[PDB]
Design an enzyme around this catalytic site. Structure first.
Site, PDB file in Angstrom:
ATOM      1  N   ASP A  35       0.841  -1.197   0.000  1.00 13.17           N
ATOM      2  CA  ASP A  35       0.000   0.000   0.000  1.00 13.17           C
ATOM      3  C   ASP A  35       0.880   1.252   0.000  1.00 13.17           C
ATOM      4  O   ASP A  35       1.327   1.690   1.062  1.00 13.17           O
ATOM      5  CB  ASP A  35      -0.916  -0.011   1.228  1.00 13.17           C
ATOM      6  CG  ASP A  35      -1.836   1.188   1.276  1.00 13.17           C
ATOM      7  OD1 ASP A  35      -1.917   1.918   0.268  1.00 13.17           O
ATOM      8  OD2 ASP A  35      -2.470   1.410   2.334  1.00 13.17           O
ATOM      9  N   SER A 199      -0.475  15.541 -12.129  1.00 12.25           N
ATOM     10  CA  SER A 199      -0.697  15.184 -13.521  1.00 12.25           C
ATOM     11  C   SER A 199      -0.932  16.436 -14.357  1.00 12.25           C
ATOM     12  O   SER A 199      -1.461  17.440 -13.883  1.00 12.25           O
ATOM     13  CB  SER A 199      -1.889  14.221 -13.614  1.00 12.25           C
ATOM     14  OG  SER A 199      -2.286  13.973 -14.946  1.00 12.25           O
TER      15      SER A 199
END
Ligand SMILES: COc1ccc([C@H](N)c2nccn2C)cc1
Length: 330
Positions: A35, A199
């Site tokens: 994770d 992004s």
């Protein structure tokens, strides 16, 4: 040193991935959910409330000659999905794919929430976010990666998650045969303890690319792709009959649909998520309403590039002095 371990989807939808981990002496092998959105290595154990264990493999520290109670240390974690676990702490030897760390904090669960009990395939979590998020008190503990880093040939790990297929986590090296083209690296902020990056935009299907900054986290422990409501609405508008359902808790779409791809930007590069990766199947057994793999992050407070996005790429988690993230197509 290096390590390399195969990671396997837990079910036919790729809801999560499990990786075998050796703990203790003699080794006890548990299948952990790696994770990159949390920083605790915790396991089902001989200390877990018996009614909360349903099929998981447990760690028994009393059977490990290298286990030592970390006296006074406790831990307690709550995840973004509302699940939680807590307990006490041992140190022990932990190996992943041939890479060994001695003295790793292994957090033994005394209590786990129902979602963990109900998932017999996940024996615990192995956190790979920054150690500043580790929940052990009163002495915060280091992740497996942080403890291994100095010994590694290169201070990196990579996630290569498969679509409906096994993939690989590597530690300490880049497998240049595992991706196509070049790796594009992008800046990371560690201020919230995550692999947080920006992004450069998105496209829906064959549509034009929209240049827009989207701050979010690279999170192997989250199944879906959670993005701003504007972006998600633009995606699902291209799917006939798709709608946001408050009763179901997100966007659903007709199971008869063919989904468009979704592209996200990494600098000047582009990662394409095929439409099929965005289908999470019927909302209940036999239903013709299917659950979408791209969902709104509104109300989470952060955008999350979860497995839906990451499995379309070969992803480098670069833990150099200034951390960065790399993405390549594959
Ligand atoms: C409501 O519709 C759903 C809900 C969940 C799933 C899937 N089994 C899953 N488990 C964990 C994360 N996800 C996506 C699939 C359809």
């Amino acid at each position: 040193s290096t390590g390399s371990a195969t990671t396997t989807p837990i079910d036919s939808l790729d809801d999560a991935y499990i990786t075998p981990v050796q703990i203790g002496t003699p080794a006890q092998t548990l299948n952990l959910d790696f994770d990159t959105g949390s920083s605790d290595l915790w396991v089902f154990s001989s200390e877990t409330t018996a009614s909360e264990v349903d099929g998981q493999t447990i760690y028994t520290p009393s059977k490990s000659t290298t286990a030592k109670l970390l006296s006074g240390a406790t831990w307690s974690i709550s995840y973004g999905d509302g699940s939680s676990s807590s307990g006490d702490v041992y140190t022990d030897t932990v190996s992943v794919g041939g890479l060994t760390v001695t003295g790793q904090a292994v957090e033994s669960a005394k209590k786990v929430s129902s979602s963990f009990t109900e998932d017999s395939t996940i024996d615990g979590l192995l956190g790979l976010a920054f150690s500043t998020l580790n929940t052990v008190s009163p002495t915060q503990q280091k992740t497996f990666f942080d403890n291994a880093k100095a010994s590694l040939d290169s201070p990196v790990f990579t996630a290569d998650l498969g679509y409906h297929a096994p993939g690989t986590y590597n530690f300490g090296f880049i497998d240049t045969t595992a991706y196509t083209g070049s790796i594009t690296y992008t800046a990371v902020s560690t201020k919230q303890g995550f692999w947080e990056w920006t992004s450069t935009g998105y496209a829906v299907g064959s549509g034009t690319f929209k240049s827009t900054s989207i701050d979010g986290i690279a999170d192997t422990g989250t199944t879906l792709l959670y993005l701003p409501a504007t972006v998600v609405s633009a995606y699902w508008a291209q799917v006939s009959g798709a709608k946001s359902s408050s009763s179901v808790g997100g966007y659903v779409f007709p199971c008869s649909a063919t989904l468009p791809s979704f592209t996200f930007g990494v600098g000047s590069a582009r990662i394409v998520i095929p439409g099929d990766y965005i289908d999470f199947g019927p909302i209940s057994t036999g239903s013709s309403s299917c659950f979408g793999g791209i969902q709104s992050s509104a109300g989470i407070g952060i955008n999350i590039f979860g497995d839906v996005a990451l499995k379309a790429a070969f992803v480098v988690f670069n833990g150099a002095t200034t951390p960065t993230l790399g993405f390549a197509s594959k």
